[PDB]
Amino acid sequence: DEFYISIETVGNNIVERYIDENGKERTREVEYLPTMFRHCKEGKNCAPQKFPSMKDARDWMKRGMNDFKLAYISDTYGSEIVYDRKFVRVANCDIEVTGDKFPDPMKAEYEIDAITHYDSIDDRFYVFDLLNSMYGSVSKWDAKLAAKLDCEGGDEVPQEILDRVIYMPFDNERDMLMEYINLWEQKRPAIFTGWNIEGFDVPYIMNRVKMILGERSMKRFSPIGRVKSKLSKEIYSIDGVSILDYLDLYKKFAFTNLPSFSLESVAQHETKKGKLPYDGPINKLRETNHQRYISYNIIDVESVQAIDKIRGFIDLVLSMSYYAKMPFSGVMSPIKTWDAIIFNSL
Amino acid sequence: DEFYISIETVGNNIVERYIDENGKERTREVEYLPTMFRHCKEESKYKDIYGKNCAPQKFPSMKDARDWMKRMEDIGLEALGMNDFKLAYISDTYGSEIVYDRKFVRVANCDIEVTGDKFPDPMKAEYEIDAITHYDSIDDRFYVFDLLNSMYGSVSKWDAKLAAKLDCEGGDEVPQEILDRVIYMPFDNERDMLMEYINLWEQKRPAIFTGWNIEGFDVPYIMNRVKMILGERSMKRFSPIGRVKSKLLQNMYGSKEIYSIDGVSILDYLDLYKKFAFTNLPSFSLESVAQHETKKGKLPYDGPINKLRETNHQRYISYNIIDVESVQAIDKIRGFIDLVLSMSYYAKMPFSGVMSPIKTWDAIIFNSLKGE
Ligand SMILES: [Mn+2]
Ligand SMILES: [Zn+2]
C-alpha cells in the first residue's frame, strides 16, 4: 500500500516511481524541501541537524544530493513501510553475441544474435533472435524441438520454461534493438538483474545502440531521459531503474566457498540441474547448431530466477531498503547503509 | 514507553535492563529461543574481512532452535551467533517503533587523577588514584571523591567557596552552576575511597558510561587498581551481572588492555567525536576539543603541573571537575549521546553497534527479514 521503487532528483524536483494502494505503478514528481541536513555534506559522518522552519531550510537549499533523496523518503514515508513484491517488476536478461572471442563491450563491433529477457510481472521469457547476424543467416528456433531428449536432435529445455516463452525473430539487428528498447518502454523494470550484466550485457547493449541507433535511442532506457557511464571496463547508469548484478549479490550474501562463480557453476550447485554438454567447438555454436544456441540463452536466463527462488536475495534487497528507508543500491554498502540509518534515526 | 537499556546473555538466557512504563528501570532474565538465525555466523569468523555476510532464515521448529542454541556452546562463549541471539530478542520483544525517553536513561562520565613518579600506566596501576569526579545525569550531580592522604602527600580538604573566587583572590573561577551540583566527599584513604566508588556504581548503575579516553586510561586504571587493592571479586561488582573482563588489543592503538563491564555500554566520547563531529584538529585532547567547542578554557598554571596536588591541591580538584563537566558541555552542543540512542532504537540493536558501519549494516540484514 504505497511504497517507492525509484527516487530521482532532476532540477530541485523529486521524480518518484511508486506503487499506490491499488497495487499499480505510478509516478509523482515533486518540488521537495528537505527537513534535515548534514553540515558535513556541504568511519566519519556527522549528526543530522533539523530545520525548524521551511524558511531557514530554503535559505539553505542549493548550498551530497543523496541526503535529498534520503530526506524525501523519510519525509514522504514515515513509519513501517509495507510492500508486496508481486507489484515490483523484476527483470533480468542474457544477451548473445558471436564474433572474435570476448567481444569487448566498450567497442561493441559485433551484432547481437539473441536477447532473452525475463519479466517477473507477466512471468514471460521474451526471446529476441537475429537469424541473420553477419556471420550468417540461420533458421527459426523450434520451441517444439527444444524439449525432446538428446537421443534426438533436441536440447532438454523443461516444458515450464518453454510454455512461458515468447519468441521474436528479426532479420537485422537494427530492427531487433528497436524492439528491445520498445519492450523496456512498454515494461520499465524496477530492478534489472542478470549474471555479469554490469560487466558485459548492459555496457554492450548501450555502446551498441549508441554506435548504431545513436545517442537518443540509448536514453530511451532511462525513464527520466539519460544514461551515464564511468569511463578500461566502463559501467553504465540508467537513471530511474536499479541495476543489481546477481553475481555481486551472490558473492556478497551466499556464503558459499565454490571454486568458480561462472553461472553454470552456481546454477549446478544450487539448482542441481545442469545444461546439456557441448559438441565440438564453442563460439561456432550459432552456425554449427543455432536453435540449441537460443535454448541455451533462455536456460541461462531462467537459472538466475531459479537461484533467486532458492536464495531470495531480491527479497533481502527490498527488505533492507525499506527498513533502512533507502534507495536499492545502498544494500551492498555498509557505509551507505550506516549513513542511511544516521539520517533516518531522527 | 517500555524500552531496553542493556541486553546480555547469561547462559542461554537473556538478561535485560529496561525502562518500564513508570519510567522505572528494571532487570529481567528471560529464557529465550531465537526464531531466526544466519548459517554464516557459526563459521564466518574471517569473512567481513572478505566482506561477506548472509541472509537470515526462520527456524522451522523449536527443535531446530534448540539444536542451534546447543551448537553455540560447542562453539564457545564469544560465538558470533550470540550477537544474532540478542538481535532476535530485541526484534521479537520490541516489534514496533521504540518510544524512548532520554530522561530515564542514566548517562554517567568520570575522570580520575593519579599522581605518580612516572606516567601512571593503566596496566601497571601502581600509583594511588587521588581523585575521581563522576557526573550522573539522573541526579545531575558531580560526585567528587578526594583522597587526602597518599604516598605523595597529606593534603587539605577542597574548598567549594575558594573554587568559585577569581584567580586574583586565590580562586579557581569554576562556575557556581557547576559548584552548586557538587557533592564533595574527602577520604582519609584509597581503600575506603574505592569501596565507596564501587558502592556508587551499584547504587546508581549507568546505562551509558562516557568520558574522554576513558576506554584506554580511566576504566582500565580504575579496574586494575580495584583488582590489585580490593581483589578480583570486588572489581566484578561494577557489572550488574558480575562479568568484567580485560582484552589486550594493539598496534597503532597499542598493546592496550581494555575492559568490558557487561550490563553497561562504555562509549568513549573521544571516539564519538572522532566519528561524528567532523572537525580537523591538530590535537584531540580534552582541552583542544573543549576550547574549540565551548569557547571557554581552564586557567593557566605557573608551576609544574605534575606536582599540582602537592603545590595546589585546591586547583587540582577544580580542574578535575571542570574536565568532567567539559564532556557534558560538548555533548550539549553536539548531541552525540542522543544520536547513539536514536540509531540503536531505529536499527533495533545494542548501543555499541552504532559505532561501526559494518556492525550496523549487519544488524540491518538480520532485522530487515521481519526478525520479529
Ligand atoms: Mn551472458
Ligand atoms: Zn548464455
Swiss-Prot record, chain B:
It comes from the Viruses. Residues 100-336 are annotated as: 3'-5'exonuclease. Residues 244-260 are annotated as: Beta hairpin. Mg(2+) 1 binds at D111, E113, D323. Replicates the viral genomic DNA. This polymerase possesses two enzymatic activities: DNA synthesis (polymerase) and an exonucleolytic activity that degrades single-stranded DNA in the 3'- to 5'-direction for proofreading purpose. Belongs to the DNA polymerase type-B family. Interacts with the polymerase clamp; this interaction constitutes the polymerase holoenzyme. Interacts with the helicase assembly factor. Part of the replicase complex that includes the DNA polymerase, the polymerase clamp, the clamp loader complex, the single-stranded DNA binding protein, the primase, the helicase and the helicase assembly factor. This is DNA-directed DNA polymerase. The gene is 43. The chain holds residues 2 to 373 of 898 of the full protein.
